[PDB]
Structures are given as C-alpha cells and as structure tokens.
C-alpha cells in the first residue's frame, strides 16, 4: 500500500433506516473464445487486490 495521506470526502448519505448485518462485494465475470464460457469454472478472472 502507498505511503501518502488519505483524505476521503463524503459522497452521499441515503437514510434508509434498515438493519444491516451482513454484506457481500459484487464482482464481475468475462467469457472468452478460449474458455467454454460456462458459468462454473471457465471465465476471465482479471487482476484486482
């Protein structure tokens, strides 16, 4: 990670007043002509950390 400084500005505050307990991060998938294009184990993973 970098050694700079963080200074996060607020985006928006939407007040929904619901209980939030669990969360999940939405990723995305890619289908190539070098893979079956199935929705199981053949897709382009990409690089992200």
């Amino acid at each position: 990670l970098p050694q700079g400084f963080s200074a996060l500005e607020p985006l928006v505050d939407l007040p929904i007043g619901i209980n939030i307990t669990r969360f999940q991060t939405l990723l995305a998938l890619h289908r190539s002509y070098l893979t079956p294009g199935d929705s199981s184990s053949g897709w382009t993973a990409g690089a992200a950390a």
Partner: protein, 44 residues
Amino acid sequence: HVTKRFDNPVLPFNDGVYFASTEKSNIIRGWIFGTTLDSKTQSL
C-alpha cells in the same frame, strides 16, 4: 487467474469498513447489505 483465484465469501459487517481496492480493470461493480440475503428481509 493462476490457480483460479476468485475468493469472495460472505463477510460480517462491523461498524466502519475501509474498502481499499487497487483497480485497473474495474472488476468490482457493487455491494449488497442486509441480514438474511434472501427475499425475506429488506436489503440495500
């Protein structure tokens, strides 16, 4: 891709989460928030 890295399990939410994502391909799209993660509760 090498192998087959795609971890993304369910994780508990604690007050304040710092999400730092190093992206060049913008693979991460959105996030979901709720309690039971099914059409049985409200979910954002």
